[PDB]
Design a protein around this ligand. Structure first.
Ligand SMILES: C[S@@+](CC[C@H](N)C(=O)[O-])C[C@H]1O[C@@H](n2cnc3c(N)ncnc32)[C@H](O)[C@@H]1O
Length: 425
């Protein structure tokens, strides 16, 4: 089977149809050898990551880019450009496989057009490249987002986008009930693998080289979970304790749900999420780590539908969000989001905060988190909420003037992420 046609179908779905790479790649990958699986992954992620340069190049190379009925050829050709640009696959091999992929995309008569464009690029790669990197297009971010980050981070926007464009680090979370972080790293090293601690995330290990989970010591025994570091940080602020009734809202796939139970094995946890599909992963992680929790489907806007009149001791709200902090792991976010999404998501976050607040007990604690770097979903959001909510007080994260704590992505850091901790005095 042709991997280049599999990547071109994978990707075109994402950009033109708005499907997530997460719903696509899984099945595709089940169909090929291990080395084929890694290369397919590299092609899909890579093309998504650079979808901008591959656009700015096509345009310099084709007076008329392939549209309408021959749009996949647009994507196949991009898959070819990615290979000529960002790998050291023998170019005759990248050309050959890309061209031959025209038969799996049912357009064998464009073999010449595909060869022709790719060869011209090898021919014009140079002038097209440079002119590209002269453009603001080099940051690989759509203008709307690039402009929001320059407004929010006048001094750091560039470091932000450079971090978004790096290959993501594989961060692991060591289950403290079975090992100390340090005891497990010792296992890691005996298995020929290298990881690094982080002072700010005591359960975390950053692997030098990403690995399959079947290669992580005790994964299937629940000694370790793949969880980005900033997300691990939520426990610092949630500070959960045994005996407590803890609501983990928007819980799937259950990274934080299980983290709470590693911190407080005897907490009574109720995990809810509006999506029955993703809810399934909570149980899976639940079982894998030999834990129990109450798992319920429900909408964080309309809580009484699922908890009637119940109040909780602590609430973790891992709010639905633009995901701008995690672009380095999901490059498709840059093409599926739109500038309009931001105020819509801020409104949904604002409503959930308003609907759940009354379910929190006086003296109780609520931690609001997002994987966004946009102020509207984060400090502003928390700013507004306190203003209109007289019985809420801010705790240790940020100030009444700049509420919460904003993480920004980096090679030895967690993802762009945001925390705000609140208490019901
Ligand atoms: C940031 S993700 C969850 C990550 C999870 N907390 C973990 O730590 O693995 C947000 C989740 O919110 C769910 N969600 C979206 N809208 C919701 C709503 N109105 N009510 C409850 N959950 C919602 C989504 O299905 C998604 O699973």
């Amino acid at each position: 089977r042709n991997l280049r046609s599999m990547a071109a179908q994978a990707v075109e779905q994402v950009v033109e149809q708005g499907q997530s790479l997460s719903n696509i790649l899984p099945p595709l990958q089940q169909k090929v050898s291990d080395k084929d699986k890694a290369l397919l992954q590299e092609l899909c992620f890579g093309v998504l990551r650079t979808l901008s340069q591959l656009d700015w190049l096509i345009n310099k190379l084709m007076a008329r880019p392939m549209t309408g009925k021959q749009r996949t050829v647009h994507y196949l050709i991009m898959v070819g450009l990615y290979q000529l640009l960002y790998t050291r696959i023998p170019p005759h091999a990248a050309l050959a496989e890309t061209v031959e992929g025209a038969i799996a995309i049912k357009r064998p008569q464009l073999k010449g057009l595909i060869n022709g464009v790719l060869r011209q690029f090898q021919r014009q790669q140079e002038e097209l490249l440079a002119e590209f990197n002269a453009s603001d297009a080099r940051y690989l971010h759509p203008s709307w987002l690039l402009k929001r980050l320059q407004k929010a981070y006048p001094e750091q926007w560039q470091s932000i986008v450079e971090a978004n464009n790096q290959r993501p680090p594989m961060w692991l979370r060591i289950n403290r009930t079975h090992h100390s972080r340090d005891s497990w790293l010792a296992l890691l090293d005996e298995a020929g693998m290298k990881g690094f601690p982080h002072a700010d995330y005591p359960d975390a290990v950053r692997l030098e080289t990403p690995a399959p989970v079947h290669a992580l010591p005790g994964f299937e025994d629940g000694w370790v979970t793949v969880q980005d570091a900033s997300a691990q940080g939520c426990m610092t602020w949630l500070a959960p304790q045994n005996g407590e009734h803890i609501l983990d809202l928007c819980a799937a796939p259950g990274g934080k749900t299980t983290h709470i139970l590693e911190v407080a094995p005897e907490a009574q946890v109720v995990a809810v999420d509006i999506d029955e599909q993703r809810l399934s992963r909570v149980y899976d992680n639940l079982k894998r780590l030999g834990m129990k929790a109450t798992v319920k489907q429900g909408d964080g806007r309309y809580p009484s539908q699922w908890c009637g009149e119940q109040q909780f001791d602590r609430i973790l709200l891992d709010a639905p969000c633009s995901a701008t902090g995690v672009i380095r792991r999901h490059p498709d976010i840059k093409w599926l989001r739109r500038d309009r999404d931001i105020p819509e998501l801020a409104q949904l976050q604002s409503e959930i905060l308003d609907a759940i607040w009354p379910h929190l007990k006086t003296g109780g604690t609520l931690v609001y988190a997002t994987c966004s770097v946009l102020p509207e979903e984060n400090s502003l959001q928390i700013k507004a909420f306190l203003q209109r909510t007289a019985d809420a007080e801010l705790c240790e994260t940020g100030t009444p003037e700049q509420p919460g704590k904003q993480n920004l992505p980096g090679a030895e850091e967690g993802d762009g992420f945001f925390y705000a901790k609140l208490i019901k005095k």
